[PDB]
Design a protein around this ligand. Structure first.
Ligand code: CU
Ligand code: CU
Ligand code: ZN
Lengths: 152, 130
C-alpha cells in the first residue's frame, strides 16, 4: 500500500507526506517535507476523522482506537496516531523521513481516510507531569492538515 | 459508518458531500451540494486514488476494483447549484468496494453513462466522519 497527504492551512504552512507499507503487517515509511514552520520541533499526529469541513478542527482527537494514553516512542504506550515531532530548519523547512511500526495502511486500525496534522509547538511525547501531556502532548494548535488518501 | 468529502478545484466549483451507511450490506446515502457549476448535467465519480498532489489529475481513473465509482450525474440548476441526494448500493464505506481514502470528482460535462465527462472541475479525498 501507498498513501499520500496534502497538508494545507490558513498560514504559510503546507507540505506533502507520503506513506508506504510493503507488507500487510510491515513497517510504514513516512516521508516528505513541510514548510512555513517556525524553526524547531512540531507535533505530528494522525487524527481520528478525515473531516476537514471546519478546517483542522473537525479532524477530532489523536487517532486512538485502543483507548490508550498519548505517547510517541513506538516501544511504549501511545495513541496509534502518535508520530512524535518533525523538526523545521532555520528556513522553516521540515524534511520528514520516519519509519513507524504502530500505524498501518491496511487491515485493522489503518489510517487511510483519516487526517494528518502538523502542530504549533513541540510534542512532549506524554513525558510531562500534567493531564494535557497524556492527551495531546501539549503540541498546541493545528497549523496544517490533510486527509490521508490511497496513492498509486 | 459516515464519510465526508470537501470538493475544491482551481475554479469556482466547490461543495461538501456526505456519505452514510447504516448497514455494511446496505446502500450508501450520498448527499450535499455543489456550487459554481454550469446549468445541467455533470459527471460525478469516485476515482481510484485519494492523491490530490496534482489537484484532480492525480486521482487517477474511474474507480474499478472489479465501474464501482460510477455514480452517474448530478444536475446543476439554473443558479449553478446542484442538490445531491443519492442512494447507491454498489459503493461502500467498508469492505472491497470501500471508497474511503479515494477521490470524489465532479466533471465539466455530462457522463453519457457509457465516460466523455470532460475536465475535472473539483475534487476531494473521501474521509471518515463522526
Ligand atoms: Cu494532533
Ligand atoms: Cu470521472
Ligand atoms: Zn496522541
Amino acid at each position: 500500500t501507498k498513501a499520500v497527504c496534502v497538508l494545507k492551512g490558513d498560514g504559510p504552512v503546507q507540505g506533502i507526506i507520503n506513506f508506504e507499507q510493503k507488507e500487510s503487517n510491515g513497517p510504514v515509511k513516512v516521508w516528505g517535507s513541510i514548510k512555513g514552520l517556525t524553526e524547531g520541533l512540531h507535533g505530528f499526529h494522525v487524527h481520528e476523522f478525515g473531516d476537514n469541513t471546519a478546517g483542522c478542527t473537525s479532524a477530532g482527537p489523536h487517532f486512538n482506537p485502543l483507548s490508550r494514553k498519548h505517547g510517541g516512542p513506538k516501544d511504549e504506550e501511545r495513541h496509534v496516531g502518535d508520530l512524535r515531532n518533525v523538526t523545521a530548519d532555520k528556513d522553516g523547512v521540515a524534511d520528514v523521513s520516519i519509519e513507524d511500526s504502530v500505524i498501518s495502511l491496511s487491515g485493522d486500525h489503518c489510517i487511510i481516510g483519516r487526517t494528518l496534522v502538523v502542530h504549533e509547538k513541540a510534542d512532549d511525547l506524554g513525558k510531562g507531569g500534567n493531564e494535557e501531556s497524556t492527551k495531546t502532548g501539549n503540541a498546541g494548535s493545528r497549523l496544517a492538515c490533510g486527509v490521508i488518501g490511497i496513492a498509486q
